[PDB]
Scaffold this motif. Structure first.
Motif, PDB file in Angstrom:
ATOM      1  N   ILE A   1     155.939  -9.783  42.864  1.00  0.00           N
ATOM      2  CA  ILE A   1     155.946 -11.108  42.310  1.00  0.00           C
ATOM      3  C   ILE A   1     156.846 -11.775  43.298  1.00  0.00           C
ATOM      4  O   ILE A   1     157.915 -11.247  43.604  1.00  0.00           O
ATOM      5  CB  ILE A   1     156.645 -11.162  41.009  1.00  0.00           C
TER       6      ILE A   1
ATOM      7  N   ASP B   1     159.634  -9.752  43.862  1.00  0.00           N
ATOM      8  CA  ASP B   1     160.348  -8.890  42.949  1.00  0.00           C
ATOM      9  C   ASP B   1     159.633  -7.579  42.745  1.00  0.00           C
ATOM     10  O   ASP B   1     158.413  -7.476  42.867  1.00  0.00           O
ATOM     11  CB  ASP B   1     160.550  -9.557  41.596  1.00  0.00           C
TER      12      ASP B   1
ATOM     13  N   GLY C   1     161.473  -5.249  40.476  1.00  0.00           N
ATOM     14  CA  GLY C   1     162.169  -4.665  39.347  1.00  0.00           C
ATOM     15  C   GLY C   1     163.216  -3.660  39.770  1.00  0.00           C
ATOM     16  O   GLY C   1     163.555  -2.755  38.999  1.00  0.00           O
TER      17      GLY C   1
ATOM     18  N   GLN D   1     152.546 -17.352  47.990  1.00  0.00           N
ATOM     19  CA  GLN D   1     153.051 -18.313  47.021  1.00  0.00           C
ATOM     20  C   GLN D   1     153.907 -17.796  45.871  1.00  0.00           C
ATOM     21  O   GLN D   1     153.667 -16.733  45.299  1.00  0.00           O
ATOM     22  CB  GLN D   1     151.894 -19.134  46.469  1.00  0.00           C
ATOM     23  N   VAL D   2     154.920 -18.581  45.547  1.00  0.00           N
ATOM     24  CA  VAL D   2     155.835 -18.247  44.482  1.00  0.00           C
ATOM     25  C   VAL D   2     155.009 -17.862  43.280  1.00  0.00           C
ATOM     26  O   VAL D   2     153.935 -18.412  43.075  1.00  0.00           O
ATOM     27  CB  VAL D   2     156.660 -19.457  44.104  1.00  0.00           C
ATOM     28  N   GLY D   3     155.520 -16.932  42.483  1.00  0.00           N
ATOM     29  CA  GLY D   3     154.813 -16.486  41.296  1.00  0.00           C
ATOM     30  C   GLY D   3     153.609 -15.619  41.616  1.00  0.00           C
ATOM     31  O   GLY D   3     152.883 -15.192  40.717  1.00  0.00           O
ATOM     32  N   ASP D   4     153.389 -15.342  42.896  1.00  0.00           N
ATOM     33  CA  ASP D   4     152.244 -14.540  43.266  1.00  0.00           C
ATOM     34  C   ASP D   4     152.405 -13.058  43.154  1.00  0.00           C
ATOM     35  O   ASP D   4     153.444 -12.536  42.744  1.00  0.00           O
ATOM     36  CB  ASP D   4     151.775 -14.891  44.664  1.00  0.00           C
ATOM     37  N   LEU D   5     151.351 -12.376  43.557  1.00  0.00           N
ATOM     38  CA  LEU D   5     151.320 -10.946  43.468  1.00  0.00           C
ATOM     39  C   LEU D   5     151.119 -10.350  44.838  1.00  0.00           C
ATOM     40  O   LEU D   5     150.552 -10.988  45.712  1.00  0.00           O
ATOM     41  CB  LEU D   5     150.200 -10.552  42.530  1.00  0.00           C
TER      42      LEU D   5
ATOM     43  N   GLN E   1     141.955 -12.251  42.839  1.00  0.00           N
ATOM     44  CA  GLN E   1     141.533 -13.585  42.431  1.00  0.00           C
ATOM     45  C   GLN E   1     141.881 -13.794  40.942  1.00  0.00           C
ATOM     46  O   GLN E   1     142.314 -14.873  40.529  1.00  0.00           O
ATOM     47  CB  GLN E   1     140.012 -13.739  42.639  1.00  0.00           C
ATOM     48  N   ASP E   2     141.670 -12.761  40.139  1.00  0.00           N
ATOM     49  CA  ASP E   2     141.971 -12.813  38.718  1.00  0.00           C
ATOM     50  C   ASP E   2     142.351 -11.383  38.480  1.00  0.00           C
ATOM     51  O   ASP E   2     142.169 -10.567  39.371  1.00  0.00           O
ATOM     52  CB  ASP E   2     140.720 -13.215  37.906  1.00  0.00           C
ATOM     53  N   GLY E   3     142.898 -11.053  37.324  1.00  0.00           N
ATOM     54  CA  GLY E   3     143.226  -9.662  37.136  1.00  0.00           C
ATOM     55  C   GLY E   3     144.289  -9.420  36.116  1.00  0.00           C
ATOM     56  O   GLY E   3     144.624 -10.291  35.333  1.00  0.00           O
ATOM     57  N   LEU E   4     144.845  -8.227  36.128  1.00  0.00           N
ATOM     58  CA  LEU E   4     145.854  -7.933  35.161  1.00  0.00           C
ATOM     59  C   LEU E   4     146.857  -6.917  35.638  1.00  0.00           C
ATOM     60  O   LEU E   4     146.488  -5.952  36.288  1.00  0.00           O
ATOM     61  CB  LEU E   4     145.179  -7.403  33.933  1.00  0.00           C
ATOM     62  N   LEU E   5     148.123  -7.117  35.315  1.00  0.00           N
ATOM     63  CA  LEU E   5     149.103  -6.122  35.700  1.00  0.00           C
ATOM     64  C   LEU E   5     149.873  -5.768  34.457  1.00  0.00           C
ATOM     65  O   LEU E   5     150.223  -6.624  33.672  1.00  0.00           O
ATOM     66  CB  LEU E   5     150.065  -6.634  36.778  1.00  0.00           C
TER      67      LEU E   5
ATOM     68  N   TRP F   1     147.224  -3.462  38.482  1.00  0.00           N
ATOM     69  CA  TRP F   1     146.524  -4.691  38.462  1.00  0.00           C
ATOM     70  C   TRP F   1     145.095  -4.313  38.423  1.00  0.00           C
ATOM     71  O   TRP F   1     144.594  -3.617  39.290  1.00  0.00           O
ATOM     72  CB  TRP F   1     146.796  -5.491  39.682  1.00  0.00           C
TER      73      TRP F   1
END
Lengths: 236, 180, 340, 205, 235, 275, 270
Positions: free
Chosen positions: A81, A93, A95, A119-123, A156-160, A199
């Motif tokens: 992040i 980040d 952790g 970009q900030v807040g990115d992955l 592009q979309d996803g989940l972590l 992710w």
């Protein structure tokens, strides 16, 4: 207290002295080295040990523990992040007890590159080469071994979703099929962060959701179980 | 041999003062407070001043040599604490606020900051140009005698340098890299 | 302290999934996480778990001199505290915006319901009245607060026990030994909090958001409904398009929930009362104390106790004995001549 | 006759912080929270806040919270790595005797859990003396006021080395002697208890 | 009490309490407005989208920023009390203010811009909030800053099994049955909404409706107080 | 704000007896007081000075007036800064002048003894009359510290303390009967002098105070007695130069101090029921 | 310097302090009793240039309802930006306070004065004490400076007598001042400065106590009744090691005891 390597190849406490009739080694995580030699236990974990023999340029005496914060190592695989981009390097980040740092170049591009592609807040998927006790760690995205590209800024979309290290480990064990076991289901794209980060991204929210949820429990199951449990998903 | 910031001695007709200086309409009043000192000039007149107990004043010189102890380490940037701009200086005002970059960590080679001078050790270097645009100073360790000088082991030992790029402790055995 | 970061996809998709009318923690749009309640060793003590959010409720007993004006109905006070350990960002002092709004916001519906009598406590109106303070401590912080926050208190309020033995004429005396019986309260009405989270033009509505949810939600509304199917308070926040009409279901829906929620208080409130009168088992929480892993309880013996106690002389005598003679010297050092 | 009261503790409770620990000494318990190793925008610094169930945090606290703070910089090898900051918070859950004691082990575990590198572990033991010269292990809210001498000791897990102590009472040296020593044996138990419990947490790690 | 078609104040429970407002008062700001809900007085002032002032730090980019201060005359009330000590209310109050415009105000064209609106209660007499609401509203209308809609807040009290609008003060003294909302007739969205009374789950439609409509009026009312100030200032 | 290129004229200009706004040196501007505008208490006034607005209220109270001086009545001044007052000082900014003027107005009227400790002293040692004079500032027209001198008195002549009779207890208050009212021209005031070179001025825009380090605090009554007077600045002055400004105090103050101290009647005459 | 860590100890290894002291050094100990007129009981003690004056003012109040006729003793330990620029510019400092109570706890662990005597009218009157001590110059054992600044400041307190006549309180300045201030117990406090391996120094200095590793203070009645023991985490210890501190503390106690006892016939009556 008094112990040596095998004296306790098991679980120990924070504050113990132990050693082997040695000369040189690399102090692990929850162990201290000072005494010829000797060792101390700092954190609370079981004893782990990987042997270098001589040729294997890798050998240490380890103490692990299922504790919260993640600890970066050699070129480890972690998901990120991006905390902020200040000058040529930005902190993402992981952790750890702090963030790490990524260069304005680790994506095989010369200036005027990866601008909106950072970009900030990115992955981010990255292996950091630098994480050493007294210094802060920094990560990369290129394949310096051959400067190829195995790690990109995530999808592009996803989940972590977080994950018990115990699992991340066991989930990443070469001798665990889950990885290939998962090689199944289509069409899918997932990433596995040492730092416990998965992710995902399947057809729809759903198969995707299941999968993750399925993952959230993965651990305790017939060494087989997941199997159909997976081919269950695989099928739809 | 003393003065208070409220008494006058001479005036614009004889000398000007650097220390304890206070002037209005031509006479000499003493700004400072503590002691009185007079000056002799190579011009047939004297300069007047009060005595600055702090004879030690800012003197870190532009391209000068210095004694310093590292702070934080970025495998890319290096940070330090400087105390002696040689030895006469004990000053701690600028305290430790100085930076150096690998490129100037040496004149040849290409060994990362991580393998030159760690967080805890004292290092020696000369000073580079200073751009107080950020309150930082540049310094170099590109000398056959320059580099770093302090060595601490994992056990808590001291290290001697076994080579140009190494330091080691006798107790345990650590073949480590530090720009000697 | 440490800013709990927040991905893009995470948020976006978290929503994506709301657009799906699917709850991430996989529940339904108007359900609550299971909420548990543990009672304290002593009376007037409680702990709530809105499933990951934890609250602490403690009530107090006092014989203060009521205020000026209506010196006929004693006062009461309550406080809500946000802990460090609460959230990371919870360094004591800054979050006011919550502690402000929330503390007051909460405290509103309390004096709103007046669900608490103020004269039954009042012993000698004008002179000695009772003061009951209640404190809320947000232990852990996960999603919807104010609700566990309310429960906490109400749940708490019913368990406390005020003392009283014998006070005649203008004298006051109370003995714990007689207090072994009188020690109840005036809980007329019991109001609870129900918050409703909105998502993108409130074109999606959630209930009892979890932490993650907490973040993603653009605007949130709360409601207060006492057992008597009536309101006490509502509050609109996070700025939204709250159509009087829609404002209406929630209101409804809130009532719906307050319903069952009460059940528990009473339910467990009873279960607790039972145990004291039977086998017996006050404490904080043995449940977490028996459930395998991360917790253990056992009782161990104390002649290892007295065996060494005599060693004290050994170290006390061996050392000090020779250490006391330096005194003869200290007698004369700074005292004799200091007469200046 | 000289036994400490009922013993229990819960680890890793609060999902929020990096370190959770709830300790229970009989009808008394406390929970400690650690938001562990943090790099704050040198070494590792530890600041701890303890507040009570009743009323707001008084100044008595401020001071008390300090002792805990110190007793720790002591075992917290954590102080090691630089730039880092570390925080612990204690919450008055169940008072009833051996107040300070509970907090210790709680905060201790707080860290154990918060896995901050420790050098040693610290446990607290408390004792009360009556106008008849009688001392007890793991005192009581009852014991405590009924006594004239009350003390809590911070001890070394490795060395027993009394790593701290604070007290109010009418005792002398003849006093401060056995009890501390006794306190040793008592702490020794706590210290033993830890091990076992810690065996629990890692029961399948 | 109130009855026979005549409330205690002496007015139709459907008829508001005449309000006059002096907007664009002191010209040493940018946004200025004065008003009194019958016998409730307060002054609200705003300063244009000036670039982030004091404490150069915090500075929301994408959209503007908003700030609003609320305080009341120590005597404006019945007796007199400490304003900087009993802050709890005011501040709480202030936020409420904040939110409201924070929603409608259009900080979407004032990145980093910082608009601060402060309000003061001169004479307090019920519907305090709703007062400053507009009181503030007007204040901005003056500082002409663009905004989604023009908004006003009303009160709605349910007594004697009936709905009254703009519970002045005396009735505020009732059972405490009082609810308020801020509203944008624009579409009629309910911007802010705060009811604090022990009413049963169904006098809402009624009470809700009460204030709801009530605003709509207050709106047309100021709609004129405003339509007038534009033409004359046009000279 | 505070510029030098401009600070130049400012100082010469004021020495030049050419202030800024067609004003010589010691020039004021249309300053009025509207008495009573707070339909919530006794004393009330809204004095608008140049571009500043001040308001002061007063109410009465019974009982203990203190411990060492029970047999009398003393005044309480509470002051407020309006977030609308200083586009600067917001929530924690009032404290400043807000506490200071609270004290400056607290000391002046304190020693002035122009206080009817007598027309305010119920049952001495038991009951006493206490009035709270509260302030608010709605703007700043420069020399604003003076507007308080007027709004502080101007609101006092209208302090129609209620005709109250207490009978041991029992209280009698006649809303129609407003006579136990106390107002006297013994009431002190504030006169300031800030220097703009050697040409020192009173009541000068901020743009103007901007060109100075110190000003003088002077206080005079109806005619010319002195209340708290002080030197206020971060700079310094010359005593010889003090007695000159000093007298400017009894000299210039009484001017519009007298002309205003009168207007209290101008409102009381053309409106006993007109207003 | 951030460097001299051992330097200071260099003296220590070869036991000796850059102060010119060693294992126990009650350096400059000085008291000025009643030096404060505008106060009923005061004592100023400056040791190694640190100044904690105990300024005690007395006030009349009302003993609690529960604790009917109970006296009233109130202390306050303050430190402004005086004793050290390295101090805050507002409300009490972290330690600033700990001590505040320390004295207090001491005051209460000591039994110096029985609340009994403070009650002006048993059950409706009480005697209030405000013993405010302030360190003018901070540097070393800020802890002891109080046990003394306070112990002495008290013997300096003297007040008239208590009387109630027909629903009034009668006590006049020139009344009868008896038992002004006397405590059956005069325990005092001492501070040792320690170093990891327990090599500890006494009456630590601003710097000495600084790079210290452990602080420990001990208060003991005349009869040697260990008032209270303080140890903000002291590297660990030994009962015996403590035993030394135990007895060797007694010694510095007699000294001060005499240091004050000496102000009895001289600075008391002069």
């Amino acid at each position: 207290a008094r112990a040596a390597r095998t004296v306790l190849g098991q679980v120990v406490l924070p504050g113990e002295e132990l050693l082997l009739p040695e000369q040189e080694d690399a102090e692990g995580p929850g162990g201290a080295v000072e005494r010829g030699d000797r060792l101390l236990v700092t954190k609370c974990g079981r004893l782990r040990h990987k042997e270098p023999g001589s040729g294997s340029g890798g050998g240490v005496y380890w103490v692990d523990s299922q504790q919260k914060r993640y600890v970066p190592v050699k070129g480890d695989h972690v998901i990120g992040i991006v905390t902020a981009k200040s000058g040529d390097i930005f902190k993402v980040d992981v952790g750890g007890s702090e963030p790490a740092s990524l260069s304005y170049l680790s994506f095989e591009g010369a200036t005027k590159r990866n601008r909106p592609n950072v970009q900030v807040g990115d992955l981010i998927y990255g292996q950091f080469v630098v994480a050493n006790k007294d210094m802060e760690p920094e990560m990369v995205c290129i394949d310096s071994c051959g400067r190829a590209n195995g790690m990109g800024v995530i999808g592009q979309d996803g989940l972590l979703f977080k994950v018990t290290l115990g699992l991340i480990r066991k989930l990443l064990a070469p001798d665990c099929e889950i990885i290939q076991e998962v090689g199944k289901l289509y069409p899918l794209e997932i990433v596995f962060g040492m730092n416990g980060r998965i992710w995902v991204k399947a057809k729809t929210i759903q198969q995707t959701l299941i999968l993750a949820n399925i993952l959230e429990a993965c651990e305790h199951m017939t060494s087989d179980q997941r199997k159909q449990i997976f081919s269950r998903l695989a099928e739809s | 041999r003393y003065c208070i910031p409220g008494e006058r001695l001479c005036n614009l007709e004889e000398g000007s003062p650097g220390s304890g200086t206070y002037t209005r309409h031509g006479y000499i009043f003493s700004s400072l407070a503590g002691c009185l000192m007079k000056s002799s000039e190579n011009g047939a007149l004297p300069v007047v001043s009060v005595v600055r107990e702090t004879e030690s004043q800012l003197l870190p010189d532009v391209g000068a040599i210095v004694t310093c102890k590292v702070s934080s380490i970025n495998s890319r940037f290096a940070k330090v604490h400087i105390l002696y701009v040689g030895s006469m200086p004990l000053k701690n005002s600028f305290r430790g606020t100085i930076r150096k970059e690998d490129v100037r960590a040496t004149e040849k080679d290409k060994v990362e900051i991580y393998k030159s001078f760690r967080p805890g050790d004292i290092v020696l270097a000369k000073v580079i140009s200073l751009g107080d645009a950020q309150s930082n100073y540049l310094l170099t360790t590109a000398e056959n005698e320059l580099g770093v000088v302090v060595a601490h082991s994992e056990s808590g030992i001291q290290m001697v340098p076994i080579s140009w790029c190494e330091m080691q402790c006798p107790k345990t055995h650590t073949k480590e890299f530090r720009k000697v | 302290m440490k800013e709990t970061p927040l991905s893009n996809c995470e948020r976006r998709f978290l929503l994506r999934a709301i657009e799906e009318k699917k709850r991430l923690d996989g529940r339904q749009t108007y359900d609550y996480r299971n909420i548990r309640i543990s009672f304290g060793t002593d009376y007037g003590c409680c702990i709530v778990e809105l499933g990951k959010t934890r609250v602490l409720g403690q009530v107090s007993c006092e014989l203060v001199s009521p205020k000026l004006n209506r010196a006929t109905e004693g006062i009461l006070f309550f406080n809500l505290e946000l802990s460090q350990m609460a959230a990371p960002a919870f360094e004591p002092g800054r979050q006011s915006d919550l502690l402000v709004k929330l503390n007051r916001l909460m405290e509103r519906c309390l004096r709103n319901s007046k669900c608490i009598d103020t004269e039954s406590l009042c012993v000698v109106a004008g002179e000695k009245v009772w003061q009951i303070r209640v404190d809320l401590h947000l232990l852990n912080h996960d999603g919807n607060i104010i609700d566990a926050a309310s429960i906490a208190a109400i749940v708490a309020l019913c368990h406390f026990r005020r003392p009283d033995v014998s006070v005649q004429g203008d004298e006051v005396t109370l003995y714990t030994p007689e207090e072994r019986d009188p020690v109840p309260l005036s809980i007329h009405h019991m109001p609870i909090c129900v918050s409703f989270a909105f998502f993108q033009q409130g074109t999606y509505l959630l209930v009892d958001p979890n932490e993650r949810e907490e973040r993603v939600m653009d605007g949130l509304l709360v409601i207060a409904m006492n057992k008597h199917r009536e309101i006490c308070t509502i509050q609109s926040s996070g700025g939204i398009m709250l159509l009087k009409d829609q404002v209406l279901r929630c209101s409804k829906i809130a009532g719906v929930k307050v319903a069952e929620i009460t059940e528990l208080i009473l339910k467990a409130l009873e279960n607790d009362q039972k145990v004291r009168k039977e086998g017996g088992k006050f404490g904080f929480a043995e449940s977490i104390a028996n459930q395998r892993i991360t917790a253990f309880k056992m009782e161990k013996a104390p002649x290892x106790x007295x065996x060494x106690x005599x060693x004290x002389x050994x170290x006390x005598x061996x050392x000090x004995x020779x250490x006391x003679x330096x005194x003869x010297x200290x007698x004369x050092x700074x005292x004799x001549x200091x007469x200046x | 006759g000289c036994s400490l009261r009922h013993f229990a503790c819960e680890q890793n409770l609060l999902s929020r912080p990096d370190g959770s620990a709830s300790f229970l000494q009989g009808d008394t318990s406390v929970l400690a929270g650690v938001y562990g190793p943090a790099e704050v925008k040198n070494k590792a610094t530890l600041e701890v806040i303890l507040r009570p169930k009743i009323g707001l945090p008084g100044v008595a606290e401020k001071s008390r919270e300090r002792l805990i703070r110190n007793t720790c910089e002591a075992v917290v090898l954590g102080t090691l790595h630089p730039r880092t900051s570390i925080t612990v918070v204690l919450q008055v859950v169940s008072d009833a005797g051996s107040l300070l004691a509970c907090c210790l082990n709680a905060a201790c575990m707080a860290l154990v859990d918060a896995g901050v590198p420790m050098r040693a572990l610290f446990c607290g033991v408390a004792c009360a003396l009556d106008s008849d010269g009688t001392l007890v292990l793991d005192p009581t809210s009852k014991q405590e006021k009924e006594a004239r001498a009350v003390l809590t000791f911070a001890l070394d897990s490795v060395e027993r080395k009394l790593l701290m102590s604070s007290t109010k009472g009418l005792y002398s040296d003849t006093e401060l002697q056995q009890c501390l020593a006794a306190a040793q044996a008592a702490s020794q138990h706590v210290f033993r208890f830890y091990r076992e419990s810690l065996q629990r947490r890692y029961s399948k790690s | 009490l109130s009855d026979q078609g005549y409330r205690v104040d002496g007015r139709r429970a459907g008829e508001l309490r005449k309000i006059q407002a002096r907007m664009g008062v002191f010209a040493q700001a940018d946004g200025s407005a004065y008003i009194e809900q019958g016998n409730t007085k307060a002054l609200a002032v705003v300063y244009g989208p000036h670039e982030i002032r004091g404490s150069r730090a915090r500075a929301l980019p994408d959209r503007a920023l908003v700030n609003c201060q609320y305080s009341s005359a120590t005597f404006s009330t019945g007796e007199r009390k400490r304003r900087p000590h009993g802050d709890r209310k005011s501040c709480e109050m202030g936020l409420q203010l904040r939110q409201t415009f924070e929603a409608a105000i259009l900080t979407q064209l004032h990145p980093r811009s910082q608009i601060d609106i402060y309000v003061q209660v001169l004479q307090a007499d019920g519907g305090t909030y709703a007062a400053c609401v507009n009181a503030a509203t007007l204040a901005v209308l003056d500082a002409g800053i663009p905004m989604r809609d023009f908004v006003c807040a009303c009160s709605a009290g349910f007594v004697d099994g009936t709905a009254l609008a703009d519970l002045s003060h005396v009735e505020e003294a009732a059972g405490g049955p009082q609810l308020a909302l801020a509203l944008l007739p624009a579409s009629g969205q309910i911007a802010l909404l705060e009811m604090d009374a022990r009413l049963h789950e169904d006098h809402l439609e009624r009470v809700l409706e009460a204030a709801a409509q009530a605003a709509r009026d207050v709106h047309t009312l100021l709609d004129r107080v405003v339509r007038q100030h534009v033409r004359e200032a046009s000279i | 704000t505070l510029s030098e290129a401009e600070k130049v004229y400012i100082v010469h200009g004021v020495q030049e007896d050419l202030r800024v706004d067609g004003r010589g040196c010691e020039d004021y501007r249309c300053v009025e007081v509207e008495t009573d505008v707070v339909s919530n208490t006794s004393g009330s006034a809204r004095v608008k000075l140049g571009h500043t607005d001040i308001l002061v209220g007063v109410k009465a109270e019974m009982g203990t007036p203190k411990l060492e001086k029970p047999n009398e009545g003393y005044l309480e001044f509470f002051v407020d800064c309006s977030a609308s007052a200083t586009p600067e000082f917001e929530g924690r900014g009032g404290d400043d002048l807000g506490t200071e003027i609270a004290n400056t107005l607290y000391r002046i009227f304190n020693n002035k003894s122009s206080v009817d400790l007598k027309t305010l002293c119920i049952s001495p040692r038991e009951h006493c009359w206490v009035l709270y004079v509260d302030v608010l500032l709605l703007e700043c027209g420069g020399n604003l510290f003076d507007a308080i001198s007027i709004a502080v008195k101007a609101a006092l002549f209208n302090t129609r303390i209620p005709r109250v009779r207490v009978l041991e207890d029992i209280e009698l208050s006649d809303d129609p009967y407003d006579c136990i009212r106390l107002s006297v021209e013994n009431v002190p005031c504030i006169v300031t002098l800030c220097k703009i070179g050697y040409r020192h001025v009173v009541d000068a825009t901020l743009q103007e105070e901007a060109c100075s380090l110190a000003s003088l605090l002077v206080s005079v009554t109806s005619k010319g007695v002195v209340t708290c007077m002080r030197k206020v600045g971060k700079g310094s002055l010359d005593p010889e130069s003090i007695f000159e400004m000093m007298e400017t105090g009894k000299r210039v103050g009484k001017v519009l101090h007298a002309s205003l101290q009168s207007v209290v009647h101008k409102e009381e005459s053309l409106g006993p029921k007109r207003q | 310097t951030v460097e001299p860590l051992e330097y200071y100890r260099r003296f220590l290894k070869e036991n000796c302090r850059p102060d010119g002291r060693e294992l126990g050094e009650f350096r400059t100990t000085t008291v000025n009793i009643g030096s404060i007129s505008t106060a009923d009981g005061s004592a100023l003690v400056k040791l190694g240039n640190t100044t904690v004056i105990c300024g005690v003012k007395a006030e009349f109040a009302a003993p609690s309802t529960d604790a009917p006729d109970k006296g009233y003793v109130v202390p306050n330990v303050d430190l402004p930006p005086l004793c050290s620029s390295r101090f805050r510019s507002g409300p009490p400092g972290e330690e600033a306070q700990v001590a505040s109570q320390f004295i207090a706890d001491v005051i209460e662990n000591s039994q110096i004065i029985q609340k009994e005597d403070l009650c002006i009218s048993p059950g409706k009157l009480v005697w209030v004490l405000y013993c405010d001590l302030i360190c003018l110059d901070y540097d070393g054992n800020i802890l002891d400076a109080c046990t003394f600044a306070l112990l002495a400041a008290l013997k300096n307190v003297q007040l008239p007598e208590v009387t109630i006549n027909e629903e009034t309180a009668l006590a006049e300045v020139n009344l009868k001042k008896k038992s002004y201030l006397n405590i059956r117990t005069h325990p005092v406090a001492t501070s040792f400065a320690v170093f990891d391996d327990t090599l500890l120094i006494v009456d630590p200095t601003g710097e000495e106590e600084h790079l210290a590793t452990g602080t420990l203070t001990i208060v003991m009645d005349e009869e040697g009744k260990l008032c209270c023991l303080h140890k903000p985490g002291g590297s660990g210890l030994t009962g015996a090691k403590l035993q030394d501190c135990m007895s060797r503390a007694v010694t510095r106690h007699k000294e001060v005891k005499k240091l004050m006892d000496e102000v009895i016939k001289s600075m008391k009556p002069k």
